[PDB]
Design a protein around this ligand. Structure first.
Ligand SMILES: CC(C)(COP(=O)(O)OP(=O)(O)OC[C@H]1O[C@@H](n2cnc3c(N)ncnc32)[C@H](O)[C@@H]1OP(=O)(O)O)[C@@H](O)C(=O)NCCC(=O)NCCNC(=O)Cc1cc(O)cc(O)c1
Ligand SMILES: CC(C)(COP(=O)(O)OP(=O)(O)OC[C@H]1O[C@@H](n2cnc3c(N)ncnc32)[C@H](O)[C@@H]1OP(=O)(O)O)[C@@H](O)C(=O)NCCC(=O)NCCNC(=O)Cc1cc(O)cc(O)c1
Ligand SMILES: CC(C)(COP(=O)(O)OP(=O)(O)OC[C@H]1O[C@@H](n2cnc3c(N)ncnc32)[C@H](O)[C@@H]1OP(=O)(O)O)[C@@H](O)C(=O)NCCC(=O)NCCNC(=O)Cc1cc(O)cc(O)c1
Ligand SMILES: CC(C)(COP(=O)(O)OP(=O)(O)OC[C@H]1O[C@@H](n2cnc3c(N)ncnc32)[C@H](O)[C@@H]1OP(=O)(O)O)[C@@H](O)C(=O)NCCC(=O)NCCNC(=O)Cc1cc(O)cc(O)c1
Lengths: 421, 138, 417, 418
């Protein structure tokens, strides 16, 4: 075989150069090219090693696929069981100590790992199940939520009312710009909505904003926190990947529960229908979410855009989902060329079910929450999603997404553009 | 149908056009009675777009429906023309088109327009603006 | 292993309880909960048994995929070769005698079986081939149809004319409401259309109605017979599954013939183009059928809707015609689409005034004659809807629809028509 | 082995026996036409049966267990020499190629059977499609001179680098850019040069000014396959109908597969770039098919698109995803024609511009696709739209389905009427 030895030698060369060379910004052109060549030679062997050994590696970390590990747990365990395959918790802590410009890009190694895992017909589906299982945080907060019908978190306020899990994204100061905490609060809230027997439909809406330009006005989402991204605070694994495999996929397929109730043989997952209401605008990751709901409402003055891509990065799974909503032409217009779609123009009827005046919006939202109660709706939405987006389809995409997005996260042009916000 | 040719379409009872045709009123001088009639077909915005700014309308675009009843592929046009000629024979058709034209365009309406048109167009015929431009055709 | 023994134990408990407990509607809450718990334990083991044993089970019944058995034959043969896995012909007869409210739901066990079979990459495609084969009734009636160009059945009148298979759905008393017999007639007629070499294109249209509200008017379809569904007369296998795997799938892919003609090496199936004409409205299963034709016509006054059970394969196909938003509007929220509104073009090629419809229908039947159309519709359907895609859906459909057939909310609403 | 190679050789023997003794195609009797037709059918039926079980073994022999990348032409010629009677030799294709389509025996169908069976194999299929994505020898030859001059003039395509843009201009002034085997060779070569040239960032495909009296001075995008050549027997199943789909059209979607001679190759073994198309006049047939793979499509107000007895390439694969099942059947099954200004053109076209405003609109489009982000996003987009399994499954069936249509009696009639 030999590939693990070649990898360990290539990673050793990288560690040597990083130890002896000057810091990032004080390196010469000759020094910049030597280290880049070492990274490439090492990463090329991470790909080649995992191309044949992915299944065996995952089997060691998961005890032949009988222990479900989430992403954070998986990429750490891989670091200790296979040194040099993926960065350690210490190496990553140094990485986030730097601004994105100065990072070595060790996260790229995590992209290589997760791509190979998800490409496996055996490891892939297993990891996707692990991420659909309830988070410990939600299991923790489920009793008090069942009693209170209320949980306040940093980035999301959750409330059960009239059988509706009302999630209100409540970053009043920053137009609900997304970060790692927001993903944690979103998944926690989504989990609670699904496990609560008093919840029948979900509702996602942006809260009232306090920033002087939007004081007193609701705003759905302004996309990823561009400031944090420049400062190096956006994690490949704990944000860009966690949100796609966790709460967004749980909106589609539900939470995977234990064998702990009747039905678990026809319904291993608890899934519920979800309604989205867009005030102000839905930009970037906020717009990405809309491709996954059962009903979408928006006020006449709102707009939708995906201004990642031209700027820096891939807009999540919008590349997977948009074409089925709008076709290849319009989806390229939106993604490749930053086209913006306004609620009142005809083609908003590709993303949005109802567009209603600000004074009539609240009432329309309430009425829409009354129309999705059935077990019939649950079976019907389940057959729809199964046809719209297959397990293989999603898994094939996210695998390549894991590497493609990691490289974009450290691209020369992205680091420039994100630092100008 | 360009210019005076397009103007004629504003006065027929049925208009057919091939999929690859277009209509325009391209400048210089006044386009006949189009200033009188186009507004009733197309509204105040579109008629100024066509007349003041020379917008060209293609047979297959939605707003061609403002000027044209049927748009047909070239191969299918001849037969469609024949079919349209069978559908307007009545004495009722004559009575109804007589009342329609009366309401659309009154004796006063036409006369008032043509009065001002007679002098306005005469002046446009001898303006330095027209004489140069038309003399550059070809 | 151990799963077959545990299964046999669980089914024994169920038949023991059913023998001793009172009838459905005379049970106490304590009693209702005991039997429900026994059903749950049994069906969970039916799933666990077949997750690992489906291929072995199917191979025994089909001689390692050496014999093509249709659905009815498959579930029956399964009952006698594997008692307690799926209900017997007897157990089903008792169920059928009851109204849906009082049934035990033994059909769910068939939902479990057919799901596991269709999930198998080996057994799945084999069963789908079996259901594409010509029905025996059609092979029986084919010579007389070749000679008379006419067959009259209870729910469908078939006539060959100008090379066109004219199917006219003629249940004048009930707006062409669908039932098991209609499926037998629909599948039979489609087979005759496909096997008759004097037929080049098919046509599906509703016949003139006799009910006083529609006397003299054609109507395409008003969907499943809700009365029969309430009364327990809608078979999961012989209606809900048979129509999707039989005549509807044959409209897409044609009939799988024997290797008894030249070409069979490149064309093992005989397929032809199909035209639909919607008079009045297409509701439910009638609207579902439109997702499978090569040309669809409709009169100006018609509408399409899918109105609590799964609307067949509409969940599979509607998204490709209309996208994810509109398809949830139609399916989840009962949106009704009118022939003359813009988005009807997602479902309908021509919308014509009733006085111009008859001639417009005729013109369309002349425009699909080529062998080029046959090659093109095959490549189009292949791209639109893959074998894996259809099989993956129908597998899950077998269980999801089986459960929806016996949900308390379904039984309630169906009994209020 | 399982007897199938012997049965094939015995069936191929009868066909050559009958062809030697029977009269010419045009002098055969009904009994004679049925005897040979039956002999062909029995042989081809065994070609399918042989390859159903032995396809991987055949391909492994020709390709050294999938270690040598052979293009289509090389593969079918090697199979002919390694497996006599499975697919025509060369001396047999030359005889076929001398005849009009009407008089041919249809030996290419045997190539359809071969390519179908190969593309169906999950091991051989992906290997062959990679082979067709590698750079052509002609382009590798011409790359240094192209990097230096920024210009290559070929018979059917004029290629020019300017402002970082590969400007492909289809320049068959006498025939409205009607396609033939040469045009495919120039297109694939031209695309390769655009993709491998590091000074090229975006591609542009447009039809050049025409000289034919009916279109003199006017650009025309494409009038589709050359019907004259098709009738005369000059349209190759492998070297045209299949080559263009697996070669340059597929390289537009995925890029060129390089060796391992640059950093990055571990994550991007293929070099792919964004492509812009501008339709003057009309895009008919194979020209219209090309539009289904670009990143931006512009067209002048007066242009139209149509797909007019053979399959329109991969339009059956791609059109439905652009236009839905109804319109895609309308365009393909029933020859519906779509005009640049009608609403549903927006299913195929991003921008429709008046002729006086078209040149400038094209230029602006080439500036808007420069990012490395654009490369990642179109790659994720194409991956979602059209999977490797999806494309491979389609082209497999296409190889046989199109092969039979090439020799259908109604095809031969229709194409021969000018
Ligand atoms: C919408 C706007 C035009 C509003 O116009 P104004 O009313 O002029 O707004 P501002 O006064 O700037 O907004 C108020 C305030 O909110 C904060 N704000 C607004 N938008 C943002 C963003 N995007 N990030 C962080 N903070 C923000 C910022 O702090 C602003 O000013 P200060 O607080 O004084 O510093 C503007 O906010 C804007 O253009 N923002 C940039 C939005 C953008 O480009 N977002 C990127 C979206 N792309 C992704 O998320 C990509 C992505 C996400 C994923 O989750 C996954 C994935 O794979 C890929
Ligand atoms: C349609 C065109 C774009 C196409 O032209 P091309 O395709 O470039 O072809 P050409 O070679 O010009 O056309 C061939 C032929 O048409 C001739 N042609 C085209 N238009 C004209 C006009 N207006 N006059 C004379 N000859 C003409 C031209 O002389 C050519 O012959 P050659 O001398 O042998 O070359 C072009 O013809 C064009 O733009 N023509 C000018 C059109 C124009 O502005 N016409 C006048 C419009 N203005 C009115 O009707 C105003 C009016 C009319 C009224 O009746 C009343 C009134 O009060 C006001
Ligand atoms: C058709 C209508 C809209 C017209 O309104 P009216 O003309 O006022 O109605 P009615 O008087 O009921 O119709 C006239 C006549 O047809 C009879 N009719 C029409 N449809 C039916 C059905 N489905 N069952 C029984 N009788 C029916 C109705 O009973 C009347 O006869 P009488 O009993 O003699 O009065 C209305 O009758 C109506 O809403 N009918 C119910 C339509 C319906 O819900 N259809 C089925 C819905 N769901 C499916 O098909 C689901 C399905 C089918 C499948 O094939 C597969 C699958 O997986 C899922
Ligand atoms: C373009 C037209 C509508 C209008 O042309 P007119 O203005 O009526 O003038 P014409 O004199 O016919 O055309 C002008 C000129 O170009 C020549 N011309 C135009 N198109 C062609 C074609 N396709 N072949 C040969 N010659 C052509 C025509 O012969 C004239 O030249 P001369 O005969 O030398 O005088 C007409 O020419 C026409 O009907 N052309 C045929 C269009 C057509 O159906 N093309 C083929 C469509 N089919 C495919 O692409 C199939 C295909 C292609 C593929 O690459 C792959 C695949 O899988 C399948």
């Amino acid at each position: 075989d030999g590939l693990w030895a070649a990898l360990t030698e290539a990673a050793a060369s990288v560690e040597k150069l990083l130890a002896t060379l000057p810091e990032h910004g004080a390196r010469s052109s000759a020094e910049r090219a030597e280290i880049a060549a070492a990274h490439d030679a090492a990463r090329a062997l991470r790909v080649r090693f995992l191309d044949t050994h992915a299944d065996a590696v995952y089997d060691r970390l998961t005890d032949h696929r009988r222990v479900h590990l989430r992403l954070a747990e998986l990429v750490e365990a891989a670091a200790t069981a296979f040194p040099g395959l993926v960065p350690t918790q210490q190496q990553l802590a140094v990485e986030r100590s730097l601004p994105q410009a100065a990072k070595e890009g060790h996260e790229i190694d995590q992209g290589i790992f997760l791509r190979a895992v998800l490409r496996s017909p055996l490891a892939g589906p297993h990891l996707l199940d692990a991420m659909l299982r309830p988070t410990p945080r939600a299991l923790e907060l489920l009793p008090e939520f069942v009693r209170t019908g209320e949980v306040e978190m940093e980035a999301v306020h959750l409330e059960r009312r009239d059988g509706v899990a009302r999630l209100t994204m409540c970053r009043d100061d920053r137009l609900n710009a997304e970060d790692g905490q927001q993903v944690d609060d979103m998944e926690t809230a989504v989990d609670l909505a699904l496990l609560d027997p008093g919840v029948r439909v979900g509702l996602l809406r942006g809260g009232v904003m306090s920033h002087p330009r939007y004081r007193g006005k609701r705003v759905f989402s302004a996309g990823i926190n561009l400031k944090y991204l420049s400062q190096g605070g956006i994690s490949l694994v704990d944000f860009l990947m966690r949100r796609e495999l966790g709460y967004i996929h749980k909106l589609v397929r539900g939470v995977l529960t234990n064998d702990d109730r009747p039905g678990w043989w026809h319904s291993p997952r608890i899934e519920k229908p979800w309604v989205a209401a867009v005030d102000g605008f839905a930009i970037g990751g906020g717009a990405q979410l809309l491709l996954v709901f059962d009903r979408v409402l928006a006020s006449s003055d709102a707009y939708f855009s995906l201004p990642a891509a031209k700027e820096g990065i891939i807009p999540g799974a919008a590349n997977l989902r948009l074409g089925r909503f709008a076709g290849p032409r319009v989806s390229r217009q939106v993604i490749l060329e930053g086209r913006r779609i306004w609620a009142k123009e005809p083609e908003a009827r590709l993303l949005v079910d109802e567009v209603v005046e600000p004074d009539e919006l609240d009432a329309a939202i309430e009425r829409s929450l009354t129309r999705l109660d059935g077990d019939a709706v649950l079976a019907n939405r389940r057959m729809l999603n199964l046809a719209d987006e297959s397990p293989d389809g999603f898994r094939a995409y996210m695998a390549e997404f894991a590497l493609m997005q990691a490289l974009r996260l450290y691209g020369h042009d992205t680091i420039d553009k994100v630092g100008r916000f | 149908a360009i210019g005076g040719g397009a103007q004629l379409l504003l006065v027929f009872d049925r208009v057919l056009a091939s999929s690859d045709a277009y209509f325009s009123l391209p400048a210089g001088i006044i386009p006949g009675a189009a200033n009188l009639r186009l507004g009733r077909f197309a509204g105040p915005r579109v008629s100024r777009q066509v007349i003041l700014e020379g917008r060209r309308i293609w047979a297959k675009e939605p707003e061609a429906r403002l000027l044209v009843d049927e748009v047909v592929e070239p191969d299918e046009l001849d037969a469609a023309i024949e079919r349209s000629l069978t559908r307007l024979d009545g004495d009722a058709v004559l009575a109804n088109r007589r009342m329609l034209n009366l309401a659309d365009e009154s004796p006063d309406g036409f006369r008032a327009y043509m009065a001002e048109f007679a002098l306005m167009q005469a002046l446009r015929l001898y303006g330095h603006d027209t004489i140069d431009k038309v003399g550059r055709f070809g």
